[PDB]
């Protein structure tokens, strides 16, 4: 019941580095990432070990200790394996397709809708009625996923547009 | 009887960095220096003040949530339309106006008040237009 206390790992040559002022930078097999933190939390680089300690004990310090631990763990896992979010649209004629690095969607809108990934995020069209986004970092991947969902969030009558994986959707009778 | 000095003023030129000192205290003290209250031979109608130069006004800082809360109102006397801008603005494009208005409020109001205000100079960056006055850096007290 204290996330900020537990420890992180360095599974396989996951180069964890500490910069000048509580700022970090990791170069895993998937890629490279960086992050900066306020100086209160003391993160120490150790061989298969890295510390997470807060000087004092009170509201803001506790919250930020928990967050920095969770962020470090999430980022190291992401740069180790890379992470993806699944979007499985539904529609009678709704279409998902590739246009090179760019992505184009066909939905009940009279014109097509385009998307331009740029942050090292990569999307795939594994099937006509399913689109999966891959990327190193959870924040950016989820941001792109929500961006796609905003193109057409589903309706509660028939269900349409974009759907996150296993995303239950409210059902309303259509009479 | 006390000596009401006049035509015996020697105005020093002072420099201060406002990068790390809050504008409130900075203004409240620099107003006194600009008025010359710090001089031992102060008089109330002769403007014994001292020229000052502000530096790095853009790096001034505000306490609390003032950076979005403090409103810099202004009313042109044209019909009932106001013009307003927040505090964090003017860091962007013209921070000398913040300091000028603050000091303007600080100093006494009057003709001699404007005369005292005349000796203030505020700039962005960390370079004076002028070095011929042999200005000397003067950190604050409070």
């Amino acid at each position: 019941s204290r996330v900020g206390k537990k420890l992180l790992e360095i599974p396989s040559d996951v180069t964890v580095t500490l910069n000048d002022n509580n700022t970090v930078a990791v170069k895993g097999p998937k890629g490279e990432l960086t992050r900066t933190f306020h100086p209160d939390m003391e993160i120490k680089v150790e061989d298969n070990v890295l510390t997470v300690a807060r000087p004092s004990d009170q509201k803001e310090h506790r919250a930020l200790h928990g967050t920095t631990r969770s962020l470090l763990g999430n980022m190291v896992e992401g740069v180790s394996k890379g992470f993806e979010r699944g979007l499985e649209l539904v529609g009678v004629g709704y279409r998902a397709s590739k246009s090179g690095n760019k992505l184009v969607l066909n939905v009940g809108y009279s014109h097509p809708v385009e998307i331009v990934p740029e942050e090292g995020i990569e999307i795939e069209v594994p099937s006509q009625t399913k689109v999966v986004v891959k990327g190193t970092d959870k924040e950016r991947v989820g941001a792109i996923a929500a961006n796609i969902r905003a193109v057409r969030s589903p309706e509660p009558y028939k269900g349409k547009g974009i759907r996150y994986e296993g995303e239950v959707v409210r059902r309303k009778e259509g009479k | 009887t006390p000596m009401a000095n006049a035509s015996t003023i020697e105005r020093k030129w002072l420099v201060v960095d406002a990068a790390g000192k809050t504008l409130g205290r900075l203004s409240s003290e620099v107003a006194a220096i600009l008025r010359g209250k710090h001089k031992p031979t102060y008089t109330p109608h002769v403007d014994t003040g001292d020229h000052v130069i502000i530096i790095n006004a853009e790096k001034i800082e505000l306490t609390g949530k003032k950076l979005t809360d403090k409103i810099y109102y202004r009313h042109t006397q044209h019909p009932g339309g106001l013009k307003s801008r927040t505090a964090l603005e003017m860091r962007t494009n013209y921070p000398e106006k913040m300091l000028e208005l603050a000091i303007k409020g600080m100093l006494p109001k009057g003709s001699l008040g404007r005369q005292m205000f005349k000796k203030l100079n505020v700039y962005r960056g960390s370079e004076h237009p002028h070095e011929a006055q042999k200005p000397e850096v003067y950190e604050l007290r409070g």
Partner: protein, 206 residues
């Protein structure tokens, strides 16, 4: 952007090679000359100062004579400057002529408007006037000043005064025809300013 400096000669109409009929304003612009290439590094901004019409030596004072000496041309009666143009595109002292424009281009035109002298409120701001009958002694007066509580009259109430003589802009005019041999421009529609006044022509910003 592009533009030239010219004089308004008159107004007429022209057929467009379709059956339709076009009203058109006729502008003459003898080849302008660039006098000074205002540049950012010294003048704070980029622009070109150019002059259009000539002056006799009797009227050309020595200052403007020496000023134009760099361009090496006759002293220019009217001078104006344009912003947003490419400095490198124009040598100082080169001519502009009128072929820079061409038929079909969209154009914005500006110039001083016709003077009209001390005019009343109705003629000036076009607000209705009191009844002409039923004993109304309020024929052509400018309305009440304002409420009582403010104990004054606000700024910006519309009252009689002078009219005309302020530069105005008309947006999205079309260049119907151009005649380089005469140094002539033909703008669709109508343009501010009296006859033989100065008109300036600029590529539309929109």
């Amino acid at each position: 952007t592009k533009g030239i400096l010219g004089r308004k000669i008159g107004m007429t109409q022209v057929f467009a090679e379709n059956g339709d009929l076009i009203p058109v304003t006729v502008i003459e612009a003898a080849p302008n000359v660039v006098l000074q290439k205002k540049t950012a590094e010294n003048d704070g901004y980029e622009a070109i100062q150019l002059g259009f019409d000539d002056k006799r030596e009797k009227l050309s004072n020595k200052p403007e004579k020496g000023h134009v000496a760099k361009a090496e041309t006759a002293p220019k009666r009217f001078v104006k400057e344009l912003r947003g143009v490419e400095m490198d595109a124009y040598e100082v002292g080169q001519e502009v002529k009128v072929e820079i424009f061409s038929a079909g281009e969209i154009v914005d035109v500006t110039g001083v408007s016709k003077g009209k002298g001390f005019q009343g409120a109705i003629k000036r701001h076009g607000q209705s006037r009191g009844p002409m009958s039923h004993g109304s002694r309020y024929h052509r007066r400018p309305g009440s000043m304002g409420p009582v509580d403010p104990n004054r009259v606000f700024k910006g109430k519309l009252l009689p005064g002078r009219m005309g003589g302020e530069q105005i802009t008309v947006q999205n005019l079309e260049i119907v025809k151009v005649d380089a041999e005469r140094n002539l421009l033909l703008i669709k529609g109508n343009v501010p300013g009296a006859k033989k006044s100065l008109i300036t022509v600029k590529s539309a910003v929109k």
